[model samples]
Target chain A: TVLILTSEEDVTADMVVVHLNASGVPVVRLDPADLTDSVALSGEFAHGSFRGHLSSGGRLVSIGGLRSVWVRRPGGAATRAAEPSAWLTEEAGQALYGMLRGSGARWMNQPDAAHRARYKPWQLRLAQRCGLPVPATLITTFPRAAREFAERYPDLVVKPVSGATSRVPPEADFSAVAHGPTLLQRRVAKRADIRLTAVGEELLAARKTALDVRFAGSGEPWRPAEVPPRVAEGVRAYLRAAGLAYGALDFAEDGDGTWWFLECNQSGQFGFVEVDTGQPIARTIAEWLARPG
Target chain B: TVLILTSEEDVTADMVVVHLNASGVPVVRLDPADLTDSVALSGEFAHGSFRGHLSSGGRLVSIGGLRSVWVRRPGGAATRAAEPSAWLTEEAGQALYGMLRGSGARWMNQPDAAHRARYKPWQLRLAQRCGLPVPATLITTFPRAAREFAERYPDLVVKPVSGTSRVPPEADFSAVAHGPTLLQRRVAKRADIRLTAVGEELLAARKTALEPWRPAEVPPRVAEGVRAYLRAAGLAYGALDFAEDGDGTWWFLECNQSGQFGFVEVDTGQPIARTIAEWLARPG
Candidate 1:
């Protein structure tokens, strides 16, 4: 059986579940947020083995029976409890994730990898180490330091290490940076943007002329594109070292035909890419989750 | 220079720093909570290498200049910012830990290992895998399962999966339905043992009375298991608790990734503090 941890309305999960059900694979989908309210779980470790079970929506599945678990943007554990408390959430999260850890089930993106991959700075470092081209970047909290970096790299963009990003104005007061650390990087003048989704050993890429493909509507549609062999190999190495079975990497393809590593979203959206490019992403994910370990 | 990340008032870190200073090793201590205030950091990723510098206490040190990093109990990031938010905390954490990760400095316990070790069930499974005897344990949100577990093992002791460990009152059982409850078979023991491990070194202390902790010889097999467990967990330091039963079998209870060893050092005269300082003072 393959278990998926995601929100109920996640159409992305629904897309993969369709293929899973069509192939007759036993699947269990549950939101950790519903724990203690609509979801119940139990696990006992005795006799040199672990036996665990999860009950949701009138179904019971043994944890040891799982072959794979897709940690696809699950909500906070126990958030839907009748009387939710921070203590309860921590307890519930520990129970669910800890039990799952013992299942020996292959994770699409292991929680540890998913967490470490979220750090933008870590991503850049890993990307560079994995043989990917990376733009010069700076993360600092000192106003004078930020100004000095901008002076060195005139074409700079400021991005939140965890949130949003923006172009750095030529004349901007960086004194506000003293409030928190700011990430400033050399902006890439790109001829096209690339979104490569890697599942297991397979890599699928889509290209667009627009900077942010998420905002595209009509003329500038994402078209199926071939991944450069160098970039593809680098992505594979990055995934192996990061211990990730899946990744959605964004890149800036400059006029020189170089793919500048931007970021890798561990659980980024893939449905949009699938709808446009006729890519077998969902099918690949289903097959990976359905394989016998 | 050795970089130590801990709270400003951490006396345990002070102990290690004393040893480091006595050894004539340069040391810099900064709290993550003080970032953006009394602390400042800058790192540039270019030219195929990372150059980072941290400024605090009117002193500047390069990230590449560090030999080791002791991640002693540091507070939440950016907690002392003038205008703090969850956003600021995460940003500060990413900027600090993320940059340090690239420095190639040896971690006392890597953040990834430290975070994963917090899960109690993971610890139990790892202990058993490393050949340590662990008591049968059950974690559930089902009341019926809890009742049956208690019936089968009448000597069951309930404890928090996190926080403090103990059997709760009857009222607590009523609330067990609201969250996951941890119940484990109690280990009837003659003494409590706190074994502190630094790198490959193991220092065991036994407590049997209301007096000072006494040094105890670790069993050969138990000592080997402790080494295996620490290596598998990617931990340079660990504080393991065991219950020495009447049968002389040491049953594993828990391993604190960042457990304090001040009392253990003071009572048993163990060189835990100095051992940690030596490990940190070594070149990465």
Candidate 2:
């Protein structure tokens, strides 16, 4: 049994659950919010049902079991104060997920691994440490510091620390904004954009020709899409080094063929890759769950 | 020299700053919110300014003389939804904190570690793994299940899943009121609370004797008060483990003796051991 913990509205998790179910896998969907007291331990134990026999002096009760878990996405609410609460509650859910990981159950992307991948700076550092070419990045809050970074890199892109689909682009003039600190990256002139979908050691690289509608519609500064062979190889090498069974890696390939690693999404958008490149991403995920390290 | 990252409001960070200053340690408080583009790396990295120097053929400048970083309470307002543009702008600030941690500066509690300590369930799990006896706890939302738990435990106390304040003692069913989830535990009668402060090692241990208090009464619940205080103060090892039935046969209730020291300080008049100070004084 595979348990997918997500919100009802997240189309991504919904899609994954549907696909996984179609693949003959028994998928249990759990809303982190629906969890309450009496069933609390059970809800917290395995997002789904656990399989075991309750041996009470010769009386045995068959407990259903969960084989694996795939945390596709966590729910996000709109309010700020409520947002932290939501995130904190999600932390509880993740903690439960962590417990399951500790129980020797297979997780497609472990919670800790997901957390390590969430921090952009950490991901970039990891990429660089692994010999991947990463753009010069600066993350700071002082507006003056940001301006100085702009002066230093002239061509730069400022992105959010956390990548929730937002309108802010890398080149927005955030001089008047008061959102605290910002992440500025030395802009790379892109020949194309590459999204590499990796399953275990097998990798399927897709070149996104058209930018995401929401991203492009925002009129935020973004590079055009193109995929070169060298860029694909760099992404594969980075994923291999990261010890990831699957990931959606984003890269900006320069005109000179130098691939500048932007970030690797451990659970990044792969439905497009599956459809456009004919990559069996869902199937690969299922295969990995059936047999993983 | 200590680098302190501070914001406009909360002064919890000031506690560390105060102790460090009293001890004669040079401190520089940088508003992480104010580190904009105008501040040049050169000003700090100039040959004469507190061990600042250039490195990587002048491409990177290193501030050498800095000793520690105290990343006190840093928070920001949420971004607007219609304005996706504003969301990324806000995340930039959060990223800056990450960058500061990445700079190899020693922190009182690293942001990630602090984050880990934030959730009660996380802290409880850690405590359990470390050989601490924890109460039989349950957190759920199903009404039928809650009813069953209430029936089983008979005297279970329920509180919010994430907040500092517990439900008032008079409230029999806190699960219905706090809509999120409740951490219900079996109520132990007449327990002597123990606050074990752990820095590099266990620093101070204090036992508080609670005056006769009804578990389900209108008067402010004493256990709820301590839990709220420790949570609000952000103590790492504020062990609220209480010994029930003080005749020496009491089991450990819970441990939260970390940040919440004010109530214990007031109740027992015990000298509050500066655990954060001990953490700062230790060699990295």
* Native contacts retained, all candidates in order: 0.72, 0.17
TM-score of 1: 0.95
**Model 2 lDDT per residue over B1-284, tens place:** 66655565655556666776777766565443333221222111111111222111123334344455655544332222123344543464445443343455566555544554545554444444443445555544334545655565556555444413243233344343223354455444454545544332332333435552222211123333443434443444454554555443334444433254444544554433355554554434
lDDT of model 1 at residue B185? 90
Q: What DockQ does candidate 1 have relative to the true complex?
A: 0.71
Chain B TM, every candidate: 0.93, 0.59
TM-score of 2: 0.66
Docking class of 1: medium
lDDT of 2 by residue, A104-201 (tens): 45666655455545666656655665556777665543456566656667776656566421323445565653334455667777766766677766
Best by lDDT: 1
- For model 1, how does the per-residue alpha-carbon lDDT over A51-90 read when each residue is reduced to its tens digit? 8899997899998898999988788999988888998899
lDDT of 1 at B220: 98
Which stretches of model 1 miss by more than 4 angstroms? A211-218, B163-176
Worst 10 residues of 2 chain A by lDDT: A45-54
